[PDB]
Ligand binder design. Sequence first.
Ligand SMILES: Nc1ncnc2c1ncn2[C@@H]1O[C@H](COP(=O)(O)OP(=O)(O)O)[C@@H](O)[C@H]1O
Ligand SMILES: Nc1ncnc2c1ncn2[C@@H]1O[C@H](COP(=O)(O)OP(=O)(O)O)[C@@H](O)[C@H]1O
Ligand SMILES: Nc1ncnc2c1ncn2[C@@H]1O[C@H](COP(=O)(O)OP(=O)(O)O)[C@@H](O)[C@H]1O
Ligand SMILES: Nc1ncnc2c1ncn2[C@@H]1O[C@H](COP(=O)(O)OP(=O)(O)O)[C@@H](O)[C@H]1O
Ligand SMILES: [Zn+2]
Ligand SMILES: [Zn+2]
Ligand SMILES: [Zn+2]
Ligand SMILES: [Zn+2]
Lengths: 815, 813
Amino acid sequence: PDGGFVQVRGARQHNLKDISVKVPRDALVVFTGVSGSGKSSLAFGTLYAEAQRRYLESVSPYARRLFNQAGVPDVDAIDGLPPAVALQQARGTPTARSSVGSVTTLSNLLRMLYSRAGDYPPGQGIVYAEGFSPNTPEGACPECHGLGRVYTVTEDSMVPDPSLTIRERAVAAWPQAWGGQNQRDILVTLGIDVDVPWRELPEETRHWILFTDEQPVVPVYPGLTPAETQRALKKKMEPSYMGTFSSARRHVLHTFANTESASMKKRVQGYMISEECPLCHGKRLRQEALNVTFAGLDITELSRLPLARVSELLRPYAEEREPGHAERVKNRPEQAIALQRMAADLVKRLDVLLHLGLGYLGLDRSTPTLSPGELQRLRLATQLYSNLFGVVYVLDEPSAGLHPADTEALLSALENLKRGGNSLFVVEHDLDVIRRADWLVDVGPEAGEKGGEILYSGPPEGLKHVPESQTGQYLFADRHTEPHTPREPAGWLELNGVTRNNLDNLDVRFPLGVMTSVTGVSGSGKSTLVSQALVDALAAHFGQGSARLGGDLAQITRLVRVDQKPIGRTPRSNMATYTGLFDQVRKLFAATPLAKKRGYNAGRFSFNVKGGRCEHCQGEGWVMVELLFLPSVYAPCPVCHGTRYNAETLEVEYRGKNIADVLALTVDEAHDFFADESAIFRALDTLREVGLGYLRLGQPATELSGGEAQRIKLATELRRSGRGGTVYVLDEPTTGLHPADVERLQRQLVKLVDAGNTVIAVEHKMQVVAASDWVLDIGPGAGEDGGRLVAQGTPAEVAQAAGSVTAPYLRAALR
Amino acid sequence: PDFPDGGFVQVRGARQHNLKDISVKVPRDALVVFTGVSGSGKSSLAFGTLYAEAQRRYLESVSPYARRLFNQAGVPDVDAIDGLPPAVALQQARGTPTARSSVGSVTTLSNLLRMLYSRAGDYPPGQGIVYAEGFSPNTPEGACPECHGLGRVYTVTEDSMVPDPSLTIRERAVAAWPQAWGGQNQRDILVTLGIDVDVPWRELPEETRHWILFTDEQPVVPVYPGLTPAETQRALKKKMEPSYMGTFSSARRHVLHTFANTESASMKKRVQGYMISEECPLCHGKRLRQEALNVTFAGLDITELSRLPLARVSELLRPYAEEREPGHAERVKNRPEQAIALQRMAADLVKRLDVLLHLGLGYLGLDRSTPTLSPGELQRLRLATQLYSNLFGVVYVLDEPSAGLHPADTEALLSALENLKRGGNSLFVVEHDLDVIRRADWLVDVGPEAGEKGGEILYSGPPEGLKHVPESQTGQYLFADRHTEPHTPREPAGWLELNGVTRNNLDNLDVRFPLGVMTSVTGVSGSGKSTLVSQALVDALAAHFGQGSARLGGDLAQITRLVRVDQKPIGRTPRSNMATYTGLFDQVRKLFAATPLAKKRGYNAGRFSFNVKGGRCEHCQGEGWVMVPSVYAPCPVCHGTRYNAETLEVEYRGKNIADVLALTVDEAHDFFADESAIFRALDTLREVGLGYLRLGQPATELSGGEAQRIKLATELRRSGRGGTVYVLDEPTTGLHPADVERLQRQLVKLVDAGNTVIAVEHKMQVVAASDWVLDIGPGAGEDGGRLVAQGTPAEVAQAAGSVTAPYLRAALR
Ligand SMILES: Nc1ncnc2c1ncn2[C@@H]1O[C@H](COP(=O)(O)OP(=O)(O)O)[C@@H](O)[C@H]1O
Ligand SMILES: Nc1ncnc2c1ncn2[C@@H]1O[C@H](COP(=O)(O)OP(=O)(O)O)[C@@H](O)[C@H]1O
Ligand SMILES: Nc1ncnc2c1ncn2[C@@H]1O[C@H](COP(=O)(O)OP(=O)(O)O)[C@@H](O)[C@H]1O
Ligand SMILES: Nc1ncnc2c1ncn2[C@@H]1O[C@H](COP(=O)(O)OP(=O)(O)O)[C@@H](O)[C@H]1O
Ligand SMILES: [Zn+2]
Ligand SMILES: [Zn+2]
Ligand SMILES: [Zn+2]
Ligand SMILES: [Zn+2]
């Protein structure tokens, strides 16, 4: 072997400059540099992606070489690369629905614990591990079928307005557009009156239409009048098609049970009535599996509890000290010999999770309600007992949402993963992790076209000799922005009686016209206080658990919340259209000599309206390849190749650029081009100020990270902030930002507080907390151990506070 | 002699199938061979435990949520495996249907030469670039417009649609129309239309027949069933209301429309009887567009190049890679960029073709279909393909990569395995070849014997240490020199002649086979053995009896029947098993008609059949298994049983109908010691060696070597008395050296009954036990196809120009 190195040659994915790099296998390798520099294009876009393509084409020959539909990484050669697992899902994909207990494997193991070692009634038999699950017919309650809720449909729920005629869509529960008129045309063949108000039809007919199970198949004649339909039938003319009846109930319940669309399920649900299952009053299973207990609890009630509580309930059984042990060993059949080996097996797994500070989560907790750093940490933990050997793990900021007090627990789980025979590729901004890495790859001087090169590949200590590196400057040369003097409050906002999750009746104060950081351990309650409780207390006070508002209210006009979520879920969405600037752009195209010749208006230049867009992709530029059965991805449209418009629309040029020429423009280049178009140039200016000059006007939203989307939403709200009055609530606003980037972000947050506005930011890094004007330290620990206001004041005041876990770290930050 | 500790895969508590709770260590980064008797557990451990786990653990890690659920039928019984990396299997699962492919795609080579034809290659001087997809017959861009890339086209004709023209339309002149209402309807349409259905077809005007048969017109008319023609016309005149409105459809329309759109098996075939198949008029059997056909290289279109031996393809590409073709310098002088391109693209083709040629596979064409390949042939294609993949740090898992190999060619196989390993990969091989086993780094010997008597680990270490392990049957053959006694060859009862044989490798070849004796047909891989035996001999015999070119005729008077016994599965779904195949289930189902419980209810001998409605399960309809690559799962309703609750309330001597299906042959032999029509049949299956198989074990759980022996066992007693020729392709498929000694006995058995057995053979263990040998082709393909030697094994052991002679000679000690 030529070292234990992976060797990469000719990598030019996105902005990579046809680079060569080598990286050790069996080591913690960290990929670093500013955002937009090309760190992900390398670790994920190139390394992970080539490693996975190769494996799957070997396990599924030709039956997976569909790959070039989706795309290949742009790279000459990679040698020495094992198979790869990404511990994060792809950029623009929906997270699937799970529980914490499913992703950790734990829920299965405790079905076998209830099946073999649990406390049955006086004499009930034995219930199998398959029958402690709501998803199996051996486990699911027969009333609700494991749903926990019972669903009905009525005439009132399905026909909200009975003055309507059947042709007037009186039965609203039927599908929109064509599917609704089909059923209506089926009824005219059957000789029912479609042009008479609903309530005037016999009860017998109204019942049938709404409730029958019957599905007759009848000739249908579109566009005929009732009378001329009956003459068609009588004279035996060719039916256009044969239609199949479906009652209103049939359609509603089949649509509910079976569709994959999320908005359709929500429409259908508007014509339904919802009630709790009475055979399992909340729980979801047979009442015989529910009789089998443990520590006084059936599976359901144990599952509500935090992982930490389940752990300390389980271990007396593992260490052989239950309420007595000599009580049932002289009588035991197998039970005690199986209960011992399982309670220890479960608690060994649980220690891994608990040591990663994840013991505040409940095993019934839904995966989409979890932060990106929470689920990547629960996936890390699961790997640590998975027994996988000889793979590469590809991680994307596993310290996101982590308190500095907890990084040694993260660092220690990564070394254990390494020591199991694996290699770790980690894109990280945390200087504490970068410092502990075996090897590091520093990418690009800057972002985009001015980045994409390798500044350094070697152990961290040698970065001290490369001066073009901004990682090396923070790490070794002491880059500060010099201290920040706290600004004085203008008023005080009171949030009293905050009941929610781990907060009992907690009373807290937020100062106004000032910037506050809300800090604390993971699972403390910051997100529960700020994002959940605060936000939907003052959304209720305006025109868009418990809580109560108070304080100097007459100072607050608007609430603006800035989330981490994408700007859109599909490639329709982009900066151009989210900022609102595309509207004037289309105006400028509609005013050109050639557009004027043809009868084009600005509408021709929309990709959201039929006419001038490519209709093959409906103007999205990109097409879904449901060829990938593991989360589907996007390929460029085979007809427009990503331009989004037909050929005739692209013949029109405003100042030597077609409309796709402008959407392909970087924020920086469009800043040049639109200098003298006032409203466009100003939108682009806030996007530039906030660090996104490398992005393209039309770049689809599915290609964007959480921090790129957060900053777009912020910029949209940056110039609207004339004077004060708006409270901005922000979750970790420096997500995916380099220490050098946050300096540029913080200046813009200063600007909007100068305007008279109040920013409240849930915050995890002391760099940002050190330049606040006020600080709220939440809860001692996580979960039951947290939830208290534990310190409040200026950063300098709080850096000396007692019974604070962030204090020492804030203090190290302050200078 | 060097293994670093903790460089090992550590298995603990493995009990898959017949495995007896075993723990083994095997080293990674080595050739690891898994050896033992048949039915002993070699594949339960290698594929069922080690491959299956690596796979489960990766798939769960790549997609947690949605894919922790596929395992609805998949979970190996094993406590622990440390040290295990990702796995790649070079032979697909047991019961999966072979994917439709060609050699060209499997190897990736086809795509490289579409690319070559696109960028390099000679265009007619008025046409532009054809892209790589324009050269495939599987895309809209490349597939010929009329045949859609099939190369074949169907027509209909007056003669195919109306066989007997003397007939009238009313007495079914046009026989191509549907049978019952459908034909009656078209006739009634013609009476309404005023056409004469009561005159011989031949005496209708020329344009009436052409219209009835070919027109695309479809008038819609009033239909009056039952009326006479004269009554029909006055029903029309006075506008009498009809039964329904009928739409005319021509003989041609009916036939072509039904064939293309029908979803019935019996329809398609019926309608196909009236249609004629022919080479496609546009492409002439080459299945591509005329514009792709016009692009040439070395004088040939891509299709003509794709039908050449991989060896010839390498020898025309090779000059261009090496820059030594005639007049090269004047090519770079006059067309520099095509010279550059051609060279680059020829170079990576040549480089990959070299790997294939070094294994022994340069005799295949790139258009050769993969379902027509042997298993060893394609696993070796698959091996070769991995050698130019860039996979690092995986375990490859192989199942007899040496099946079909000549002992002259095993060293080429060993070089290939070594090259793979040194890529930073590990190798798990299940093997019976003693020469491969001799060279392994490590060796896992399984069980003493089969099923219940095996499943334990006899040895795990370097091959030589197997001398201190006396209970091991592989060690006996490999170190103790275990062998049979020498065989004296029987005299032929006659000689059948196969003359003028012309196909594939062979042109006008004359051959004789001795009757009443066992013959082995041997020679190197690709030399022509299966073509002679499995193809020409079998085709010529099945034609001579009721049931390429060659003519027979020696002592033909002495044979009456042909039966071929192949490696092909006994059936393709779980519906088929060993019980139902032999037919012993007829007596079992009838014994369940003898129970007094089956008298209280009217239980017809036919409630116990899973093949007919009634007493079977109604989610799987008696398969007992459900579809979920594709793998099988247990039924949601009958729970892997086949039967409903009512049927399984009847027991025969404390045994249900399902219980008896769960019976191993060896057990059923004890339990049915009195039911002659069952016992006798169970006793053939034991003689053959299949006592470890369950009576109703899905056909899809069987190996192929196992299916072959079930076929042979069905023959052993119908061989009873009579004159049948048996043709067998490698009767020793998944058999250990100790298993073949007892299969010989069964082959001798049907010769003693006055039969003739002809086997295409690769192991000199059985060739030594033959009465005659036919040695084919000096080498493979175009270097083969000749009869180089013939005689008793001793006679051929001494042949000069024969490559198998030295090995046969050695095997004769
Ligand atoms: N999934 C993706 N699809 C398309 N473009 C991408 C994707 N990820 C990154 N890019 C682009 O690659 C360039 C480099 O950015 P990136 O790879 O994200 O570096 P970093 O990880 O340091 O932010 C940017 O122009 C960015 O928009
Ligand atoms: N959607 C939810 N469902 C159930 N419990 C939740 C939810 N959100 C938060 N919690 C619980 O609240 C406590 C911490 O609140 P959170 O705001 O999530 O902490 P932080 O934001 O500091 O990480 C934890 O015990 C956590 O499990
Ligand atoms: N795919 C399979 N499905 C079900 N049973 C199997 C399968 N493969 C092997 N078995 C069973 O396991 C036992 C051992 O066979 P096997 O592991 O194939 O040994 P060997 O590989 O040495 O022939 C046999 O009873 C056989 O029927
Ligand atoms: N089904 C087939 N289609 C096309 N060519 C074939 C087919 N079967 C065999 N051949 C060719 O015939 C020659 C001899 O092959 P074969 O009879 O299969 O040899 P063997 O039985 O010794 O392996 C080879 O050139 C091979 O490529
Ligand atoms: Zn219920
Ligand atoms: Zn398009
Ligand atoms: Zn054709
Ligand atoms: Zn069933």
